[PDB]
Amino acid sequence: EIVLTQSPGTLSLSPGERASLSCRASQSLSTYLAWYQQKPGQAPRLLIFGASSRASGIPDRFSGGGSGTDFTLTISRLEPEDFAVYYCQQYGSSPRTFGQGTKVEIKRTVAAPSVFIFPPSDEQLKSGTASVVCLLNNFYPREAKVQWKVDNALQSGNSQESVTEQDSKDSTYSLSSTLTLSKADYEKHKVYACEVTHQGLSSPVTKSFNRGEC
Amino acid sequence: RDISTEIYQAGNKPCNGVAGFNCYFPLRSYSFRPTYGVGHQPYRVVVL
């Protein structure tokens, strides 16, 4: 399997006239690469074949370029519909391989996140599993750091992070982080806190609650 | 040995002798460059 990577993991740009995508391949492909646009919730659609010739049914704005190791996909004019995950697949040498893919984000004014912390419900405590949910609202860029601190001690590997897709109205991302603890473990620690670090935030914001609404 | 150049039919619709969608020329040009990788590079083969 030929090793291929996309140089921009994620690109954020406004819906204007500027777009660029780069794929680098360890072994020369001799101008044998293709690009696919996958809309979220939809099957992938071929954009270009061979990186030189536009596929049928593809708008003129879409363009492809590059040879051998370096392949570049540039969109002359960008529209909201165009934004989607983009995958480049190498077929020159068997086995055929697919790139990890690049999502084109929509550029928006940087916004500090809104942090909400919810203590576990009494019914959940009756169940015996305690979950603390940290909610982030309307934060751009999508990338964010959430750290759980219990008794001023960081917790790693006990949290699951869920991110919604970019909201259409304001181009913003919302993230929920869940910390799962056993009832005995939850009882042991009096204070639960979550530290969030974001570009918008001047300084990291920590939101905390005391056990049993202490 | 097959040397037929008849347009391949990949669709229910009659090919019509025109290489439209679902009709493709069977022979595909083979591209060779010096810069191309060794695997892509042309090898002359003779079998006795």
- What is the SS3 string spanning chain A? CCCEEECCCEEEECCCCCCEEEEEECCCCCCCEEEEEECCCCCCEEEEECCCEECCCCCCCEEEEEECCEEEEEECCCCHHHCCEEEEEECCCCCCEECCCEEEEECCCCECCEEEEECCCHHHHHHCEEEEEEEEEEEECCCCEEEEEECCEEECCCEEEEECCCCCCCCCEEEEEEEEEEHHHHHHCCEEEEEEECCCCCCCEEEEEEHHHC
Which of A28, A33, A67, A94 has the most B C-beta neighbours within 10 Å, making it the best mutation to test the interface with B? Answer: A28
> Helix or strand or coil: residue A122?
helix
* Cross-chain residue pair A28–B40, CB shorter than 8 Å: yes
CB A67 within 8 A of CB A57: no
With beta carbons under 8 A apart, name residues in chain B contacting A57: none
Nearest CB among A27, A56, A68 relative to B35 is that of A68
Phi, psi (rounded to 5 degrees) for A80 = -60, -35
* Cross-chain residue pair B37–A30, CB shorter than 8 Å: yes
Q: Using what technique was this structure determined?
A: cryo-EM
Give the Cα separation of A76 and A65 in Å (integer): 12
* Cross-chain residue pair B36–A92, CB shorter than 8 Å: no
Give the Cα separation of A30 and B37 in Å (integer): 7
CB atoms within 10 A of CB A25: 22
Two tokens, residue A133:
């949910």
Strand A102-106 vs strand A153-155: parallel, antiparallel, or unpaired? Answer: unpaired
- The distance from CA A34 to its chain's CA centroid, rounded to whole angstroms, is 23
CB A13 within 8 A of CB A82: no
